[model samples]
Target chain A: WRQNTKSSRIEAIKIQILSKLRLETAPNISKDVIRQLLPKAPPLRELIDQYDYHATTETIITMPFSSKIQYNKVVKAQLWIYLRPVETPTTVFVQILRGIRSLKLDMNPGTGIWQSIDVKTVLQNWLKQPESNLGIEIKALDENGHDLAVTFPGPGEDGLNPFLEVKVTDDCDEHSTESRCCRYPLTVDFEAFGWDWIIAPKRYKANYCSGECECCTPTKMSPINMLYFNGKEQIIYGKIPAMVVDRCGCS
Target chain B: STWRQNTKSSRIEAIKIQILSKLRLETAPNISKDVIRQLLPKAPPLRELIDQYYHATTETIITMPTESCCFFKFSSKIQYNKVVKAQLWIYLRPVETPTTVFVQILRLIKDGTRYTGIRSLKLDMNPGTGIWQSIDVKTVLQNWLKQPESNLGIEIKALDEHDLAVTFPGPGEDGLNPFLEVKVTDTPKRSRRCDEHSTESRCCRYPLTVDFEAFGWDWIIAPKRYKANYCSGECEFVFLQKYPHTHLVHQAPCCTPTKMSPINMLYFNGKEQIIYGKIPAMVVDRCGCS
Candidate 1:
């Protein structure tokens, strides 16, 4: 029987969302869908509110998506990101383990657009089985080869999984302002989990509760905690509190 | 003062010796004893030494030539600007050979100092011509002698052809303006044309006779009709009362009207005619006379 570690299970969930978003082509997909996919995605609300991605910050935002994937499993994954009120066109690279994947897109305050590799390929290849130990990082690059955003994902101090999601909402109708509304799309993903060998479960929980948990809450804690409990169960069989892994925006 | 007095005394002694030496060569030579006696009267202290020298030098009768015509007195009071002035006289000697002479005048004692040499006066004499020539004294006076006995020197030379030049005795001094006034005598005679007949023609030719009274002279042509007193042998021609006069006449006759003579008519004729048939009208005696 395959033991479902917290990391492996969290990675599986990340893969599912990444796969759905990679092929996601609905005219009315809401930002909640992307939120459910990667719960702990870095705060792109500022980038979304401002709707302008500086080249440097973009590198930080896109890097994790590329980095979470294993090179041998998926040759490349294309990602699309959209911002609003497209004002300037930009091109950037998502650095993967093997090489760099380029993303050329336009961004504005109200709406923007981008595409990149599906996060499912990354999680599947990186975590082939349950209860696997792995580290995940994410960054977004702008047209000028500048880092825009970055995210780090791994087991919490409690040896639970961590994940990220980026959600973008637009008021503009895609049919009428298709170019503009599609500029920024709701899409991002991250996952990592391990417990028994890679992390001390009780120690991790104590450290997490002491350090990160006291600071803020998460956006959607279900996926983060579910991945976390998968690894927790590999160590000891019990229901872990999913709310404990909730993602929160610092600023 | 005492040193100056001693110097004067020695100079006087030297002069006496010079005079005695010059006198010894004269036509009447003095005897050594006589010379000693004469010396004793003037310088009693030297009498014994003179007497001894006379006997010891019995045959050594040193004679010096006596200078003749040496006295020079300014013929007149020389006036000069306040500078040093040098007056010189150069005598030319007769000579058969050709020669040239150079001369310069100089001043002495510029600001109370002894003159070393002559400053240039630039006087020169030409051969076969009279030597004495007047110099513009004002020029020299203006240049050299504005100060005082800037002790000066004058130099004279006879280069050739018996030429003579005179210069100041010493170098020019700073003061005393020097004025040069030279009266050269015995100049060579110059020839001049006689204008006795032409004078009357010239007077009447350009109506010059009209202004004759302004010149303090009467204009009259020779051989006119006026009869004046003839001192007989001294007179060239006697005036006649008519064109053909009678031979007998004691007193001078009255003046008569006369037409122009042939010689005068040649110029006064109505139509322009050539003088002497080849020369132009009224132009007589074209050759210049000097």
Candidate 2:
């Protein structure tokens, strides 16, 4: 038969593990630092899209623009989508997006031209969820709201791309998952194990593919936040995608 | 807040560079390779998906961590976009650590059968301290961008050479989206001081970068961000001396008759008066300073 356990018994078990664990660290690791790196890394916004416009009826960009902010944390965040018109126009159309979530924004400019959406609000609905687009799709319309066929990258494809910037608040859900319930106390002594820090692999490597992959492809990644979970403390090395740092050093 | 409303029809390439994020984590804790594997975006690395990112050329954003350095690597291919000249500037505020802060933008250049990361920014370190400073790079980046190569991989970190140099805030911090801005012009500018007004009485200083001797315009030695000098001008000194060694018989390199004019020449960089060799003041008819 299973042993009968009371609430006091559960609390006693926690103290048992806490008491067995050493509190003094030879080289202690900060718990908060680890939190900033993982599941809930610090918040950031980037201009993920850049393009030019000669004006097209519908200019669509297909790239994933998602957020690290999750859960019940609803904060007022801003995502700025900027497109430089070949020439100033009467009306411009721009959109803010995440996963399958989106909100309409644009510029008469500076009248809160920077579109402010309740990042969590839009995110919350994805907490419900239209069409999840990887990149953005915009259209330049006249005050008449008609088409504008545009060619960005101006003359070349690399030079011009539209710009998309996102912002999240510090008042965010910083917890990775609400499931990690143990308050792990300082314990493991890697020095005792005669180790120089863990040389864990990164999410990226020269041969960075989980399945049948080809060469020279880019994969998207978020920064590392948990310092000692998989034990990423010592020297974090990557396989420098064989395509990048050539073994020959190509003189 | 505005869509960074910038200039559209100017040859000056007026792309706006704004601070999108400013983040500084006191320490960069590490996550295991497994966790890293778990968090990074994944897919079937198809050229279709890969090319989209390559052709779209995304800017690399970085910051400080407790770790050595962190880099953002796209699929390992260089894009084929021709870059006339471009710069990768970092808004660095070096504190406690005065070590060398290095930034490398990597990509795969076709080497026989395999791809190589030879396409990169060959820059040095900054061992100074200041407010918010700017680190500007040109040539190497120009080499990297001008090519039709795709895929952009960027790394930002500090190397004290001996100790752990952990001071600057990286992408994790708010408003610290350090940008890699590329100024892509169709062709290189004829921004030379020696070349023609190609033929004019004009005096305008061109915006400049490095000594560029390799590119044929070598006057400055160090590579700076950019300086708009009232200094460079078409009118340096056309002082046609009416006096000694006067009218020293000169040969016209262009074979055009040397037309000498007595125009007041001003310095391109210095505030010194028109610098001219005392020769004869002939008529301002030939291809001389207008």
Candidate 3:
């Protein structure tokens, strides 16, 4: 892409189909017999490409499910992945993806200077409660891996954006501090948005949904945001729209 | 005369791919002149080796309900229809739960005609690392070029029970063959569009140096006297969102479009010149008085 407007122009390697894979319910096949029995399942395999690894890879963020729901449970956040390589290299880009599981962060290349890549990986069993987390994907690749659009410094500049930290635990003696893994173990109607909704970390999905999404008509169909824990009672979460009808009745 | 190993850069090279390519051969299957006879000519026990290759698989754990395939048996047809695209150079491997391979293109309507569940489509099987990957059968090559003796079948399914190892390369392995490359257009560095000026994405350089992070951009403060102009392939972040201007930084910069991104460039030294377009390339500051 000649940045703005040079000309010689050539293009095509776009190859995008980011995702469309959702088929993993064949163990016994429930959801109530697919209503009657719909499981021929021939074509299966979607998401596995986005490799502009043409060189200098860049995939800034891909949170497979970077846990959330702290203090009040799922443990008080313990996921950490940092990268401050303002610049440096010999080839090593788009290094850490989570879903399909990849890792690079320049592996151990070298050059000028400046470096940052801190992902210790404790996740504490992905919080261990409701939805959980850790399907986060961030990209940057060179050794010619794949994935492009490597720009950072969002909304503002100082280029910081990578945030989420943990380091507090010392309750020795009948309880004095308490905050290490925090007491995260609830399980209400959970939630997750992208990255396969945090690599399927949404607790069997609590209620479950991955279909209902529309911007077609009827006020643009919207209703999927569930977060119930301590004192719960609000179900009806994401993707549950195969033509819903209670017509505003609230059943 | 043929191609493969399409992309793999940086990591100091060493990747040497194998995308595969061969084409032209409808009724001709066993080539190498049928393993070249006449050496007293008695090698007919089926000695088609020379590192040759061919592996199309299907396994419910090694063929039981195992229906893997590989039959492009063309008796003549598809001499060239609107082919458009068809790359399915599979060579996967993954047995215990890793290789969840599944690809299908069973088109064989006798000949001269074709159709199938809308030509089915779905690709995925970066299986347990065996290698070789290229799948985009362009809707079964647009229905196997519409049809003729038609036998373009390559159905493989291994949703992880086990037994899935492919590495076809038995016949003239290196030069490559087991081909599924039928393209009409595209593959020219993926066309390289948006703002334009594309050297077919050579996508790599060290032959002399100067890549500057493929220019998603940088230098909030680092342009210590810069100069490498090749102007506007727009500024390539898909063209600054869409045709941004300002210009005046080389590698596509006369110097002025400072919203961001390295603009365009490839103007190397010792000998390298490319100053394409999308102009705004100005000058005349001190001496010339403007």
Q: Best by TM-score, which number? A: 2
Model 3 over residues B1-290: C-alpha lDDT tens digits? 11111322321121111000111112212212212221111111112221122011111100011112345432132334534545555444434343344444344443465434323334455435444455566665554546533534545433343424242433323322223444342121222221223252322211212232343222111221233221111222322211254222233211112111222111111111111111121111111000
| Chain A TM-score values, per prediction | 0.22, 0.26, 0.17
Model-by-model DockQ, in order: 0.00, 0.01, 0.01
Reference-based lDDT, each prediction: 0.26, 0.28, 0.26
lDDT of 3 by residue, A1-251 (tens): 22232121111100101111112111233333222221111110111111110111111122113322233222233222333333334354444444333444444433322233344343443444535344545665554444332234333223233333332231011222332221112122213321222111234211111111210011112222211111111011112221111111000
> In model 3, what is the error at residue B271, expressed in angstroms?
64
Judge candidate 1 at residue A28 and give its lDDT: 26
After TM-score superposition, the amount by which residue B112's alpha carbon in candidate 3 deviates from its true location, in angstroms, is: 14
Which ranking of candidates, highest DockQ first?
Answer: 3, 2, 1
Which ranking of candidates, highest TM-score first?
Answer: 2, 3, 1
lDDT of 3 at A69: 26
Model 3 vs. true fold: TM? 0.16
